[PDB]
């Protein structure tokens, strides 16, 4: 008698914001892509092939130099690879054997690693002794980590299975801000390029914006029929893309909150594992259960390129900040760079 | 193309050699996944073999054993169930004298976990060993509370053999996952023997298809 009317008020506010989506987009993205010529058949060839691991790899991250990347797997190894010589440099052991999240600092000084044991660990790469040791354990949380990101050298956003994202300071080892709006456990996030706002997507089939300075929510995103597996942010800082088990990649604008187009083709029964863009856009990289990776267009959202390098579930994918090369990796213990 | 490149090549070769040595050393361990549910005798079983998940290791004869206990995870199973795809054995622990407690009896709800985990796609063929618990209090108190459809004798052996049969009956279409039901009294000397034979025979079977004879 009091919560039902409040939920109806919520539904009316959602309908108002949907009318706002249906008026802000006088013509959606897929309707304004006739003029722009397609990217064409992009026959990406493997210039180098990054082999040498053993077990199922699960994450890879690029550096600011666009030449040093970090690979993390369930075997218990963080390996720092090279771009052109393909000769790895740093091998780091792991206190927890099972790990799914990893991040490389923009300056390259530190590296964050995290498993499902609700423990986030941070190591220092450039040390006086020349080795890599435990700089600090973040911890302070229950459940399982899902995404870690470096907002600053001393500010970090973590998003874990306790249905709560946390902005932490490494110096004090305490949660600077907490975000408990989500009801289901979150899966991944992508920080803004300006490093002032961030979106977080959960298994609630929804996502929400969060501010660092205020520590509260700013905007809701819904429409998915199931849990959002992956989400990446547009480098312009106004939009982002989500991918889920519903086989529908979606592009939601942060400042327009509108459903542009559900990127999906029937022949697709596979679910999305990873999503990324280019430095200049014009292409949406994606990862599906079918082992053939797919690259679509950021605008056209039509079949652009198919990459059949791996014969297993594509686990991680990334683009260099230069936009020069792209690296993908799957459970078959192999990493591949295209160009 | 100078001394720096040769030193980088040497360092990469040394790291590759250390990686291959660590992999060869770590391949010897056996993978067991415990699926203890509430008061399923988790403390009793960890006594018998000796905030996140708990990793335990023990030695039996010449073979090591590594087990991961997932307790109070309270998360969706589908996100992290596939992380134990490479597990060799799946151990299930279920109490028997809890058929009078309803939070919808827990015995009915415990089949739902077993029926679902068997018919999953990742675990199409994995050895499943189910254990028991609280036999003595089950026979002391005992039928119509939880299983009125059976409507048979109240003696322990006929009642218990019925209950373990319904656990093994609902194997679904994954009959390759043989259910090694065991009469764990919770005071037995070495219940890990029940695991040990049930891994090593399977190890022989895991050789055979590789061996080519079967």
């Amino acid at each position, epitope marked *: 008698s009091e919560l039902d009317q409040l939920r109806q008020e919520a539904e009316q506010l959602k309908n108002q914001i949907r009318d706002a989506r249906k008026a802000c987009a006088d013509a959606t993205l897929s309707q304004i892509t006739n003029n722009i010529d397609p990217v064409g058949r992009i026959q990406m060839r493997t210039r180098r092939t990054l082999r040498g691991h053993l077990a199922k790899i699960y994450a890879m991250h690029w550096g600011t130099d666009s030449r040093l990347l970090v690979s993390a797997s369930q075997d218990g190894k963080l390996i720092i690879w*090279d771009s052109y010589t393909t000769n790895k440099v740093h091998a780091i052991p792991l206190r927890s054997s099972w790990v799914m999240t990893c991040a490389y600092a923009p300056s390259g000084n530190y590296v964050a690693c995290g498993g499902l044991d609700n423990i986030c660990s941070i190591y220092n790469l450039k040390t006086r*002794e*020349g080795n890599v040791r435990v700089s600090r354990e973040l911890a302070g949380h229950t459940g399982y980590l899902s995404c870690c990101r470096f907002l600053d050298d001393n500010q970090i956003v973590t998003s874990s299975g306790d249905t709560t994202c946390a902005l932490w300071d490494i110096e004090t080892g305490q949660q600077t801000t907490t975000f408990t709006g989500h009801t289901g456990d979150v899966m991944s996030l992508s920080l803004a390029p300006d490093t002032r706002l961030f979106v977080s997507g959960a298994c609630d089939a929804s996502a929400k914006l969060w501010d660092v300075r205020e520590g509260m929510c700013r905007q809701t995103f819904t429409g998915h029929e199931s849990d959002i597996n992956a989400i990446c942010f547009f480098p312009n800082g106004n939009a982002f893309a989500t991918g889920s088990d519903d086989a529908t990649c979606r592009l939601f604008d942060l400042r327009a909150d509108q459903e542009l187009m559900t990127y999906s083709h029937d022949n697709i029964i596979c679910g999305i594992t990873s999503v990324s863009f280019s430095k200049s856009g014009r292409l949406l990289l994606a990862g599906y259960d079918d082992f053939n990776c797919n690259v679509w267009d950021a605008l056209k959202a039509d079949r652009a390129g198919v990459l059949a390098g791996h014969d297993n579930r594509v686990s991680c994918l990334g683009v260099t900040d230069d936009g020069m090369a792209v690296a993908t990796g799957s459970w078959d213990s192999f990493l591949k760079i295209w160009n | 193309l*100078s*001394a720096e490149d040769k*030193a980088a090549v*040497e360092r990469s070769k*040394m790291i590759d050699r250390n990686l291959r040595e660590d992999g060869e050393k770590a391949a010897r361990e056996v993978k067991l996944l415990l699926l203890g549910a509430g008061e399923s005798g988790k403390s009793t079983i960890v006594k018998q073999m000796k905030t996140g998940i708990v990793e335990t290791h023990f030695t039996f004869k010449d073979l090591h054993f590594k087990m991961f206990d997932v307790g109070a995870q309270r998360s969706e199973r589908k996100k992290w169930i596939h992380c134990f795809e490479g597990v060799t054995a799946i151990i299930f622990c279920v109490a028997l004298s809890d058929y009078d407690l309803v939070l919808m009896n827990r015995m009915h709800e415990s089949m739902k976990l077993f029926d679902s985990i068997c018919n999953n796609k990742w675990f199409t063929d994995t050895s499943i060993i189910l254990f028991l618990n609280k036999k003595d209090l089950f026979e002391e108190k005992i039928l119509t509370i939880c299983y009125p459809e059976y409507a048979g004798s109240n003696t322990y052996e006929e009642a218990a053999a019925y209950i373990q049969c319904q656990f093994e009956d609902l194997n679904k279409r994954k009959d390759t996952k043989e259910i090694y039901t065991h009469f764990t009294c919770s005071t037995d000397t070495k219940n890990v023997q029940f695991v040990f034979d049930a891994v090593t025979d399977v190890i022989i079977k895991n050789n055979l298809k590789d061996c080519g004879l079967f």
Partner: single-chain antibody
Amino acid sequence: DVQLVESGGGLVQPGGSRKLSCSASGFAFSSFGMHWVRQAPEKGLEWVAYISSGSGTIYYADTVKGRFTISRDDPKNTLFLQMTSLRSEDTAMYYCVRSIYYYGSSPFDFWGQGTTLTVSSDIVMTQATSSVPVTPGESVSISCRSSKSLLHSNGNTYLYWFLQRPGQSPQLLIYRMSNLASGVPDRFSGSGSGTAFTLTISRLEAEDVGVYYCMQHLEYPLTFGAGTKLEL
């Protein structure tokens, strides 16, 4: 920090034999390379020896190609150097150098103390003059020219510099002609072409006096420069 002290030398007989050791502590000996570097007692600084991290490749100088060997021991975390048939050109102030070679690494990071070891072609570079008078507070530039340009195919200029404090170990100032090192102020800079190099120093005071040397890491010989003693 780390300790890279030496076993110590004496007045070895000419053409004799001796052992030397560089004591190690507070770092990973098993993952670091090790160098031994000449320094003439009167004036000079040259190369002696080399050992890689995994003992795979070992290089030497002209006279050091024979008559000298090096070995490591990782359980004790220690180094040994067997010297045979010492000559007058061989004996020097043997400085112990640690280095690790990888992407973005800064080689020649730490230097030892040396020994008072006095008994009884290849690419040659040269500085302008070894006695350049300077004044505090005034910017000076000292140039070391090389016959063969150090610009490798990858585009990296292989060069290093060093400042030798009075009666103390040297410290690195700039690596690869463009990037600095740890524990140094911004006042040191590198410039020049691939054939002629220069180091610019400024804001001179009583904490920068000594000798400076131009490096060469392009090929197998690590042939040091003649050197410049910055006088006052």
